[PDB]
Amino acid sequence: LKEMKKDERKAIESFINRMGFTIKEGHEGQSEFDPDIMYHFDNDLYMQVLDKGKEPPVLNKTKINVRMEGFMFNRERDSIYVFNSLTSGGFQESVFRYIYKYNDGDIHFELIKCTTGSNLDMFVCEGVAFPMTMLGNKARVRLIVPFRIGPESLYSRGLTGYYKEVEYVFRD
Amino acid sequence: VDLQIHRFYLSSKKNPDLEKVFFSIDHAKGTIINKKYMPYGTVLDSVMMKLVTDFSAKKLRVAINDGEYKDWHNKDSLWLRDCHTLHLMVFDESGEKTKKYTVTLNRYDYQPTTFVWHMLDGVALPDINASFVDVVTHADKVYLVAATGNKTLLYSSDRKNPVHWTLLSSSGLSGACRQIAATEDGRAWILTDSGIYQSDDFTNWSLLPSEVPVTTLLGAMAWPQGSHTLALLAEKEGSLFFATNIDGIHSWQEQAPETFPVRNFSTQLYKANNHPMLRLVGGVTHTGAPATSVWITSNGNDWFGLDLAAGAIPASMEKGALVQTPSDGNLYYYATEQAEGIKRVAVAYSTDKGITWKRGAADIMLPADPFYTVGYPLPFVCAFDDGAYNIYQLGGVSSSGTFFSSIWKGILKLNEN
Amino acid sequence: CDDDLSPIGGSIQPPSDPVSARVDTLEFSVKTIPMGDIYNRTNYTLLGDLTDPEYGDLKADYIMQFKSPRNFKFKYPPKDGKIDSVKLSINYDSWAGDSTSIMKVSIYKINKAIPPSYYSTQELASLLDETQIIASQTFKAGNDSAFHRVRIPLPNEIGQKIYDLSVNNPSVFDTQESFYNNVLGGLYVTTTTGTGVVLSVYNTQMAIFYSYKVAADSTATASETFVNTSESYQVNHIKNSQISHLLQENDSLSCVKSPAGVMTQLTISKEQFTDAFTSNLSSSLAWQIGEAQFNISASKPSEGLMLSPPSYLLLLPQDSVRNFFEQEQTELMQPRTAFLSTIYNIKKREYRFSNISRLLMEHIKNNTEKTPEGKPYITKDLVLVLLPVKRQVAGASNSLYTSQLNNFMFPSGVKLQLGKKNKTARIGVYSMTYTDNHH
Amino acid sequence: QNNNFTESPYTRFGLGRLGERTTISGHSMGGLGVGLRQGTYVNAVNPASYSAVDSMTFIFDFGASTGITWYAENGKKDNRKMGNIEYFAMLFPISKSIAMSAGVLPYSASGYQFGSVDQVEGGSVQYTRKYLGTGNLNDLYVGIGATPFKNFSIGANASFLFGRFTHSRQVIFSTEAPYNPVHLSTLYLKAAKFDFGMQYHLPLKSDRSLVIGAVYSPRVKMHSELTQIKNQVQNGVVVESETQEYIKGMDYYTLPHTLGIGFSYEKKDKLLLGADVQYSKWKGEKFYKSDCKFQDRIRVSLGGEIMPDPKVRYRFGLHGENSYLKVPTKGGVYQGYHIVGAVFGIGIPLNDRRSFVNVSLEYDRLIPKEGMIKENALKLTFGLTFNESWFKK
Amino acid sequence: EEKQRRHDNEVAFNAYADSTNFKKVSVDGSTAYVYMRWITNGTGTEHPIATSRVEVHYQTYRLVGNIMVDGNYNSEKPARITLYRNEKDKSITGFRIALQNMVIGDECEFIVPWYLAYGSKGVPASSANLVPIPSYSALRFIVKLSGIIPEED
Amino acid sequence: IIPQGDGQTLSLSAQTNGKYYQQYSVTFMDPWFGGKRPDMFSFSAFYSKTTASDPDRSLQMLGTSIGYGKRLTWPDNWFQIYTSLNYTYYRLRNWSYNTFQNFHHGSANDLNLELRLSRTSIDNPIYTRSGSDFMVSVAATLPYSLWDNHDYASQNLSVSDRYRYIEYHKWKFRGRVFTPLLNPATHKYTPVLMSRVEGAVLGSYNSNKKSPFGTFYMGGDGMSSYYGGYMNETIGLRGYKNGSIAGNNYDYAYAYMRLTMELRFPILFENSFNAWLLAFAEAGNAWRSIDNYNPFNLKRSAGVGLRVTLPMVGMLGIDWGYGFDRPDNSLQRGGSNVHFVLGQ
């Protein structure tokens, strides 16, 4: 298992310097985000807020739909899975309720399963729902989610997700 | 583990159709029966019997008709050209355990679509000169409508005994009968040159008020409880549109396709899925060419055609005749086909309640009337059903001038008894 | 170590200590009333027509609008521009009726704006002012194998216009209003004729299939999709007809039809509340209702029916029926006023609720007034309705909980046994009568 | 739930049964706590007796008890078993005359449980009614005694009183899934009590000795917090735990003035006789929502110790008292009751000539007026007095 | 391990014999047998044939643990099942043996041993069904027959 | 292992279970620090770490302590005051167990000053015949809540800001008494009467900020925790299940009291092998809030047992106890239970 952690550390290090990225440190409750700096948030999550958004969500009340575009990579092989909902059509939005519950770790979402066609419910994880603790409605972010807070289905394979752009909009 | 048969079938090197035949196996009585009859005229010269059995099955013995039990092997092509019963005996490796099976081959000894026909004696059909003639059966009464030039005549007779025909005194009617329609409760409509006329007794006719000049009366329904939907085809601008006349109220609907008939078509009203439905067969297109499609509908707003075979429906330039036998639910359509320069009668039959239609052989289905061997001088075909395995085929000769004279009654042979 | 209820104490008990138990029988009054327009947020729609002998008719169709992606700019410039086909796919998962009845589906193009509302409508007369026929095709529900789709070719003009607007024209695929007013309008999907089936359509797509980039010196088909989602506004036209015989008085049964249709309303009078609790003249007693069972037995459905009973029923007051679905709540979020039955199982054919005493407590609590000479009394009747709902579950197998509760959008019908003939509208309210004089 | 000390229904009113502040040796002599002056055990009743212990001693006094109680009624009978730890205290010297003591003693205890099963009125199914109650008011005390003037001694006890009393009443239905109601009342009490005692010990001719003692306890006002809850349960407690009322403050509960006079005659190592009278001014003291009328409480005790020349000391005693409250009799007026009792015990010495093992047996009877609960209780008490020689050079 | 699984499955099935209530039954010419009851008795004298398709309401249980694996009892329309048509369209042997003796209107419970239900093949959970069938599992069926499809179809 | 040398000792030990809970410890004491009087100066340091499954679910603790102990002669030449200064650093890596309330991921610091006064005059501690043992101890921390000015009443306060500096004030007391029924010189085999009283209170400066570190786990035999951390004191109550009184359902108490009366009958007295039979009666309880402290209505139990002393092993024994009362938040009495005691 520790080998998977080491391989993920190597993959993250080789990916961050592959394109121009400025890694900084982030503290909880941060409010001011440089629109050109990627932050490290102590939960191994990497965030670069392209737009802060609007009014913050209400806990255990707001239901949010997300549209994400990006791909997943490994230490040596990339583009194992590619997903897109912001540009290509034919994909139902993914809906989650904003909650807080410590079942095993920090869980900030309750997914509402979509039963009306093809979607990306298996690409919604803790890393995707985390930026809602700070940002607001109509929010656009870029994320690098390690396997620990990645999708639960793709946990054994130890894949690292890179979300090129995730957009959050309130309501169903 | 013991001795049983789970699947059994026949296959021929020269005949591949034996594989599709399915056999049902009853262990309680030990009988193998093909419940679907094998097609007439088949040949069973050399055939292999392929059967799926248990592993414990070791020895098999086959007896043909009343022959001898012969030790059977999987590589035997047996001879059963004239064989209708077969006996099978299965043994295990021990040899003492036995089980008997009887296989009976079901085949049509004659043509499955043969008909038997008879003259009706004493018939007194009126000698009437008319262009459009139709027959409508309600309860236990047949009514024949004829468009004699500019006028309209109606005659009545008994469904069971159509021997005697009586003229009816029509009151309120005017113009020439273009088309007729009727529901199951006896109410009838006739479209003439003037507006539509309505009656409940085929005698007293009231002019239905309207403004849009209708072009054809397709049919009538009684779907809204207490009302009477009336499907119509009218002319708007320079195209044809479907229309409804539900309780006098007029409405416009979808645009008719270009292959939709306007004249000399046969209509019928039936029921499916707890809903009245209309079926329309044959006719002449708006351009003038004949139409060879079947159109059904449920509300009169729009119609759609079925996916038939390669020209199963005969192409006719004049009125056909659509009849139904309700006891077996069979549909028949008689039309006039211009085959090799001669007007003959062609029959299209259906047994799947109108789902599928197949062209039939005229010489077997139709009567053997000598006067119609060389052609069909009359410009229309009339036929009405009876209610149980009985059809009437008005017309033996051309009579004194025009119109039919004699009546033919026919029964499907399969349902003779 | 001994646990037996000693009876010794009681001869020196204070006069205001002792308690007691009581039972009161309460009567419902049962009616069947039109359900009304239903709130529907999901993407499910119904397409087709149905006729049932004991339940009347239903005609369902809809109007849809496609979801516009931002900066569409689809790949692989089509060879010399242009495209090949614009086939539109209607996807359905299940149906009600006969899987072999032939229907005729027509696709029109409208030029109006879809009204903002999530309620199913009837008589959409204003929208269909001009319209324009695009396509029409016959189909049947069950097509063998598992190809549960309806594929309808469309004219190439709409796909060509979409492609043109994405390259040589401004990228207007930004706001939904701009996409609806410039790129593509609203599509009206209906069945012009035929009867016997209703499809539960869950989405509809419009695949624009183009040639490809030249691909060295070959070419290989590629395509777009343009699905519709629940973020936009649809129009569901659900119309139930000839159900007037279900609304007439019949004192042994009450019907609940699902798509709009009819529902069962239960009314407890005010006097029945007044001379069963509070009341009296001492004004020192009080009631604490602790048990009130309520179970309903569904009548055995007759053979030949096309509609089957709904799996779940929701019992809730009629006043809280709007805000229950507009806020997308769940029976676990209002445990005091909304109750969910159990699975309709053909072994016993009954919907079993449980102790509803909290509902009666809630009704008594905030509807008790006093006449000028004391005499507390109830001022309003208790009105409840039974609705057919669709429940979506989640959680582990041992712990299953109601994740989502929506209004049921599929043809169904049930005849419950509630009336005066066999005393089926009876509840036995078990209460505790203590005394309390600290006022 | 366990009640440990008592399950008498009479403890439903007031602060329950009023306990005493005597150890095993004092209790075995009928409750003699005022007149006794012996430097061998703890005599927390009269603090002036502290200044009688030897110069190098650490007396640690433990104790426990068990027993049975028989309750009788109009026609019914019942019996219950008790058993618990009575107290524990310590006493050591401080200077040439001054001594100090500490420990934990019970001030009062209360507990009961009863009810019955009946049929739902105007119905068919059955239901159970249960009335429960527990409560304890403890006492953590520190005392000091001295003898400044010859043949005269004084003492003072400072006590911290903390306690809790709960009374509950409930009905249990017998259905598929009911909401059983429980009406509950909780009361928390804190205070600070003081006791002042004086003693005069005149040595008579030869070996005879006379002891005369007095003890006084001022009125105490107690800080109180009362809560009334109305719960509904299905298997565990569920929603609607509504609190009906909550009242907090002082000046709602009081403890009365107490006076005690005791006399004792002691022939050394041969004979000890003593008696004492205690008066409590419970009349007119406040108690919020009390369902009874208080009355002045009188306690009379008399006992003796005889040991011949094995060495086992013998103790006997008789005590009586009147009730301090009037419970409401069924269909009548507030009435009281009396209590009488007899105690006999032994005081076996041990090998180191300093420790003691005491075993006592007590029988007491409650005498009501008429038509009330009758109680006869038997009790066996086992003590231990560990006397070690500390403070040695 | 699995051998002990076969052993306790067969010891349980065998106990369902002496459990007097449930008579043993078999089809003609087969040593195979299935233990069955007669919860309800129907009207009619038409038994299904080995090649007949019958629509029923059914529930399936394992003998070990009695875990529900399949069932359509929470629906009004009966499900159509075929006894035996070919190697692709069929059902387990015990199901055929049980249904060949019933009649329209019956509701019977029958115990099918491991070697008549699935043998050693085993049923992986896969999609749809979530509870897999362990290899060599005896089954407990409750089947209510509603009618018989004619062979003409 | 006692590395005696340099006029002092350097005893040390380390225990690691075969699956987790690695721990190491070193101790260094000076019996004659200063060179004038037997004033103890002890220094002890230790480290311990304990651990889909668990990727990095790990609890680690760095501990250090100093202690100066005296041999006071003011009351009498037996009182032994003892002052110590202790510090412990807690760090967590996603600790799923509801141990330590909601502290799951952060890290906390503990700094306490301990003052203890005791008097012990018993004979050989293996089998005591006469004497006493008394102890009163206090352990307190710095009230950071009065200076950091962080409002703990609200819920929005950060988890790191909440569980970072531990505040409490813990009090303990204990007293044991032994007495021989018969003369030790005349009879070697003599019954021994024993009485034990002990209790503790864990207060808090702020009514909302309470230490998740150091709560009580009562019930059963009681030796240690085989699934969680060792930062919760385990108190044994014979006649009940393990954790039944307080600790099951993750309910940890903040005060407790236990009273024991025993009677020991010796059996074997040979060289270094002793064995005896004991009959005991116990009463105890533990409360989540201090206000419920009630030293009279406790949970009772009684029974018998057997003890054996063995060289290099320590003490081994078996006890049987019957619990008469139902624990709080339960509906079953203690019943009949068997407890094994290992070592002290």
Numbering used by the authors:
A (entry chain J): 32 to 203
B (entry chain H): 39 to 455
C (entry chain G): 19 to 457
D (entry chain F): 31 to 339, 347 to 430
E (entry chain I): 31 to 183
F (entry chain A): 503 to 553, 597 to 889
Task: Show passages lifted from the paper.
The composition and architecture of the PgBAM complex is very similar to that of B. thetaiotaomicron, with a pronounced extracellular dome formed by BamG–K. Only very weak, not modelled, density was observed for the periplasmic components, possibly owing to clipping by gingipains, similar to what was observed in the isolation of tagged PgBamA. All components of PgBAM and BtBAM are similar in size except for BamH, which is 88 residues longer in B. thetaiotaomicron. Structural alignments of individual BtBAM and PgBAM components show high structural similarity for BamAGHIJ. The highest Cα-Cα root mean square deviation (RMSD) of 6.3 Å was observed for BamI, although both PgBamI and BtBamI consist of an N-terminal Ig-like domain and a C-terminal six-bladed β-propeller. The extracellular dome of PgBAM is much more compact than that of BtBAM, as indicated by the distance between the BamJ and BamK PPIs. A total of 12 glycosylation sites are present within PgBAM, mostly located on BamH (7 sites). The tri-acylated PgBamH lipid anchor is clearly defined and, like in B. thetaiotaomicron, positioned at the BamAG interface.
The β-barrel assembly machinery (BAM) complex is a conserved, multiprotein machine that mediates the folding and membrane insertion of newly synthesized β-barrel outer membrane (OM) proteins. Cryogenic electron microscopy (cryo-EM) structures of the BAM complexes from the gut commensal B. thetaiotaomicron and the oral pathogen Porphyromonas gingivalis are similar and reveal a 7-protein, ~325-kDa complex with most of its mass on the extracellular side. Remarkably, besides BamA and BamD subunits, Bacteroidetal BAM contains a 14-stranded integral OMP that is intimately associated with BamA.
